[PDB]
Design a protein around this nucleic acid. Structure first.
Ligand SMILES: [K+]
Ligand SMILES: [Mg+2]
Ligand SMILES: [Mg+2]
Ligand SMILES: [Mg+2]
Lengths: 153, 290, 159, 67
RNA sequence: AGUUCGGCCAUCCUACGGCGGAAACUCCUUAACUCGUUCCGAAUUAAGAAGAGAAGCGCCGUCAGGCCCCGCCAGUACUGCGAUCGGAGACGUCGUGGGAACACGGGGUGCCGAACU
RNA sequence: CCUCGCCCGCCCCCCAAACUCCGAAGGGCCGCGCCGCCCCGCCGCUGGCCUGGGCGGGGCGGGCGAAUGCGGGC
RNA sequence: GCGGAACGGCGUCGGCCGGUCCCGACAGC
RNA sequence: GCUGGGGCGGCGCGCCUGCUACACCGGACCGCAGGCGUCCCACGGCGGGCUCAGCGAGGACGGAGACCUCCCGCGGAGCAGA
């Protein structure tokens, strides 16, 4: 039919991975979260309390509440021609920290370090801006070529 | 004609357990319950009092769980006891009490190494003498400084009435550690309170002395063969609580650890060689032989 | 050989399987308790009706019981009654032949004798912590068991 | 074998008229129903490297235990 | 080198042969006490120190099964965008982008951390 | 004692909208400027502690760190 | 130069793969 | 009332699982295979201990199956009803 129970159409997204059944490792409980941190949502099918809805599987958001046992996560959801901010409570088995800012943090650190380095020696500051791949430059190649031909059918 | 049970498909789909579970060392349910903390308490260390018992001695440790490992901040063993006045009878009830007391005193002294005012050692001085009664350090805890708190972890042992794990925990509590617990699993417990006399008797090895006396009294051959190490060192039933009290006083006086000396020995049993060219030779010869 | 490789009787299990609850079960359990000096236990059919009782005996008392039971059969047992794990058993028909004093009122009852052989160090497969399997060389094979039994209770076998 | 190879194609042409659509008749370069071309099959037979079954043939094994 | 407590959870598992113990771990001995087994000191609890590498454990081996990496499979199968391109249709083709799987061949077979001996 | 069957092993033809050990093209969500150092204050929360977390203040150094287009919001 | 299929054509043009042939093939030893 | 005219028949008229559905979410039909309007003071809470189905081998009034024992057993059992 068409019924829309809380867990409809979850035959594949809530199943365990191959040879990864059973209890979760203990790193999922003793890692530290702070307000404003970016996290990912991935549902674990062996834990049935604090489970988010199928819609939130594979989204990223920020922490707005640190609780005794659950976290509060803010997520942007599009509804028709508008975006709504949804706040949900998730238990620890369904949340992982997100590396969506690691590249920017490393870029900032490197930019500052390079700026410090050349100043002490006085060397000119290089360009600290990313470049989209530019066209190739002039160069010279050697020839030991192999003749290529088309085969018969 | 008999079907094969462990087939190739059996191996393809097999999932191994965690390594420490395969060796039967840790119960991961209990550990998860023990090391869980409120998320709004962030990276604040949480300590458990770990007690283990081998065939020859007793181990006491205070450890904190980290992200990628476990951190030990104090450990006491039953080897050290002869260094304090107890040469024999290790791994029995009195020895467990003594090792727990040693661990507690050593941890408190290490914590108060430098501090001068309100040091954790001056405040919360353990019970002056072992009386075998219910004592709780947190009763009337100092407001400015609270007592060190740990949680007891038993492992795979059976938590029965009269077990030595609880003896080690009682010894640790007598040194000034705040370990939550009741008095149900101690030898003096009844439906209405409990009597410190039985606990005191056990803590001082009265049962061992009585057994030694009765055995030597009438059946002396079995006594000689069954208490060879006791008899060799000249330990007699009547002069037993005195030695235990002297050991308690000595431990409570200077409870620090002196490093023992030794050198490691690596045999050849693990020195056998790992024989591609050499492996490839043992097939050509066998093929030619056949 | 190493002294740790020698065999001993590990346990002996006495079974009487006569269907239906009643003084038959009660009388059989009473006789089992009297013989073994150990209370028996009942087994429930798979439903919920008692059908049998049994008791396990360890130590030397098992050795004496087995000695008498073999005496019943004249130290003769088929060579093929040894299991692939190194165990064996037989079955008397009345308990009076064991040397027990007959009772007109108690009745008669057939019995099952199963005895398990073992070596020192089999504990590794039974303890609660660090449980493992015993090595293939330490296990008792049927031929070693037959040799030990024949050399122990003076038994001859018939093919 | 070579006896009935003179009429196999006519049998196939006869069967072609009961099937809808368009079909083609081909002669395989393989040996019978095996996966070996005739040249490869004959070579591997003159080199002693064929385990034989009631219909099919397979190359000798080079993995697993000996004996 | 060993043990206690851990992290990641097979390159660590499974089967079968072999090597080793000074210390350690283990196997071992006893049932007065403590506690214990639908019955059993088997398990478990308490108390020991005459034996032992025979197991468990550490290491080695196997044209080993499994697990892991690289190549080939193959620019193949499939596919996004554009086409008054072919064809009655079923389907195919061209231009411009992305790109497998099985099978098969070669090789490999636990590290990391804190405390004690 | 023979001769085919059921059973065990290998090999092999052909399959699945309600089979999947594997798995694209294609889609979806998030990020792409402020940073670093030092010191100070408050908490009735949190910790064995001189621990944390949160919210503020004061000094020092540095700086605008992909392309393309274009004013936005209620 | 009808909308159009299985299936036929010794109509014409163009190919691919095999034999025999001045040691005389094919069609009329 | 819906409705490949209406009637007769049926009830996608309140809910639930899998598929249809074309790898975020959404997605139609009187589309496909089905279910619900109940049952349980224990079939509920917590703690401890234990390991299931079954293959193989053995015990025999005892057999294709009762009960007993050892071995190996990644779940092939069980967890009220789809
Ligand atoms: K209509
Ligand atoms: Mg527990
Ligand atoms: Mg109407
Ligand atoms: Mg509606």
């Amino acid at each position: 039919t068409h019924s829309q129970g809380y867990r409809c159409k979850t035959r594949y997204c809530f199943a365990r991975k191959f040879r990864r059944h059973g209890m979760a490792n203990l790193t999922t409980y003793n890692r530290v979260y702070k307000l404003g941190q970016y996290v990912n949502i991935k549902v674990n099918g062996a834990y049935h309390k604090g489970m988010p809805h199928r819609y939130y599987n594979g989204r990223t958001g920020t922490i707005f509440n640190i609780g005794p046992r659950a976290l509060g996560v803010q997520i942007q959801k599009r509804v028709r021609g508008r975006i709504m901010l949804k706040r949900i409570n998730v238990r620890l088995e369904h949340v992982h920290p997100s590396d969506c800012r690691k590249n920017h943090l490393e870029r900032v650190a490197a930019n500052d370090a390079a700026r410090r380095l050349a100043k002490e020696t006085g060397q000119p500051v290089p360009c600290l801006k990313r470049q989209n791949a530019l066209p190739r430059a002039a160069h010279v190649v050697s020839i030991a070529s192999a003749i290529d031909i088309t085969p018969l059918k | 004609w008999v079907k094969v049970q462990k087939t190739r498909s059996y191996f393809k789909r097999f999932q191994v357990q965690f390594r420490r579970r395969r060796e039967g060392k840790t119960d991961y349910q209990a550990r998860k319950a023990l090391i869980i903390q409120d998320k709004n308490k962030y990276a604040t260390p949480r300590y458990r009092f770990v007690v283990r018992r081998t065939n020859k001695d007793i181990i006491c440790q205070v450890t904190a769980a980290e992200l990628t490992k476990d951190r030990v901040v104090c450990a006491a063993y039953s080897h050290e006891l002869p260094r304090y006045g107890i040469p024999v009878g290790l791994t029995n009830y009195a020895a467990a009490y003594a090792t727990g007391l040693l661990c507690g005193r050593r941890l408190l002294e290490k914590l108060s190494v430098g501090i001068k005012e309100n040091a954790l050692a001056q405040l919360y001085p353990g019970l002056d003498k072992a009386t075998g009664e219910e004592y709780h350090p947190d009763e009337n805890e100092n407001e400015e400084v609270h007592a060190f708190k740990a949680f007891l972890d038993i492992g795979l042992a059976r938590a029965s009435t009269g077990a030595r794990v609880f003896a080690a925990m009682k010894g640790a509590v007598d040194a000034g550690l705040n370990i939550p617990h009741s008095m149900k699993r101690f030898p003096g417990y009844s439906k209405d309170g409990f009597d410190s006399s039985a606990l005191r008797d056990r803590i001082m090895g009265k049962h061992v002395g009585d057994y030694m006396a009765e055995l030597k009294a009438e059946d002396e051959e079995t006594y000689r063969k069954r208490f060879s190490k006791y008899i060799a060192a000249k330990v007699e039933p009547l002069r037993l609580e005195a030695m235990y009290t002297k050991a308690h006083a000595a431990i409570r006086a200077n409870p620090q650890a002196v490093k023992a000396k030794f050198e490691i020995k690596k045999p050849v049993r693990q020195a056998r060689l790992t024989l591609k060219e050499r492996i490839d030779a043992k097939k050509l010869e066998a093929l030619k032989q056949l | 050989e190493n002294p740790m490789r020698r065999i001993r009787i590990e346990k002996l299990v006495l079974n009487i399987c006569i269907g239906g609850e009643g003084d038959a079960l009660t009388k059989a359990a009473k006789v089992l308790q009297q013989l073994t000096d150990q209370e028996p236990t009942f087994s429930k059919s798979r439903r919920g009706q008692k059908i049998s009782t049994h008791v396990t005996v360890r130590g030397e008392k098992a050795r004496e019981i087995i000695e008498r039971g073999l005496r019943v059969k004249n130290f003769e047992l088929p060579y093929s009654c040894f299991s692939t794990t190194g165990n064996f058993g037989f079955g008397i028909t009345e308990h009076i032949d064991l040397g027990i004093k007959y009772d007109p009122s108690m009745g008669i009852y057939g019995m099952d004798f199963y005895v398990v052989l073992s070596r020192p160090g089999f504990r590794v497969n039974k303890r609660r912590a660090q449980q493992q399997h015993v090595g293939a060389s330490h296990k008792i094979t049927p031929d070693e068991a037959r040799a030990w039994v024949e050399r122990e209770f003076e038994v001859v076998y018939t093919k | 074998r070579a006896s009935a190879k003179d009429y196999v194609k006519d049998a196939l042409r006869r069967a072609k008229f009961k099937i809808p659509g368009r079909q083609a008749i081909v002669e395989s370069r393989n040996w019978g129903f095996t996966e070996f071309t005739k040249e490869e099959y004959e070579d591997l037979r003159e080199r002693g490297e064929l385990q034989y079954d009631g219909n099919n043939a397979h190359r000798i094994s080079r993995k697993g235990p000996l004996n």
